[PDB]
Structures are given as structure tokens and as C-alpha cells.
């Protein structure tokens, strides 16, 4: 943990539409579209979410937080993250 290979930890959540559906009753400020685009889906347990690829989990979100930024901060090895945001983006989140 987390998963840093090229195979998704949860294939059933690889589709954006599948992930966005999990946010049907989302009551938190952090944007659902942004979360789903960042690879996350809701567990239905508070504001807990997990990335379908690396399986990384995030909770206790702040109102203006950026999902992609938190994804890179805690799970830099995620391959979906790499594919979507690039290595420079990730490395910059962990700048000297």
C-alpha cells in the first residue's frame, strides 16, 4: 500500500461515470466532479474516498482543497495520477 503498478486496484471503478455515481448523495463542499476526475469514488462513509487505481484513501477534506493535489501529495506512485497529471506535477508537489 499504496498500489504503484499499472493495474487498477478496483477495475469496477475505472470508469468516470461509475465513480461520479457514488457521489449522488455527496453533501461535502469538495467538488464531486473534481474528485471523480481525480480518480476517487465515495465509500459512503463520511467524506472518505479512494482512488480506483492506487487504492489510496483520503478523508477529512477541506472546502477549497484540490483533489489532484492531495492525490499527488499522498500517493505519488499512482499510475493513474501519472497518466493524467504527469511526472513534473507530482515531483513539484514534493519540491525540495
Amino acid at each position: 500500500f499504496p498500489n504503484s503498478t499499472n493495474l487498477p486496484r478496483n477495475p469496477s471503478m475505472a470508469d468516470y461515470e461509475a465513480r461520479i455515481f457514488t457521489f449522488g448523495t455527496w453533501i461535502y463542499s469538495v467538488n464531486k466532479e473534481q474528485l471523480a476526475r481525480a480518480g476517487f469514488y465515495a465509500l459512503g462513509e463520511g467524506d472518505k474516498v479512494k482512488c480506483f487505481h492506487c487504492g489510496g484513501g483520503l478523508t477529512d477534506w477541506k472546502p477549497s482543497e484540490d483533489p489532484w493535489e492531495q492525490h499527488a501529495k499522498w500517493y505519488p506512485g499512482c499510475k493513474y495520477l501519472l497518466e493524467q497529471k504527469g511526472q513534473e506535477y507530482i515531483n513539484n508537489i514534493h519540491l525540495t
Partner: peptide
Amino acid sequence: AKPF
């Protein structure tokens, strides 16, 4: 955000 906090990881879990």
C-alpha cells in the same frame, strides 16, 4: 485531507 487526511489519508486512511
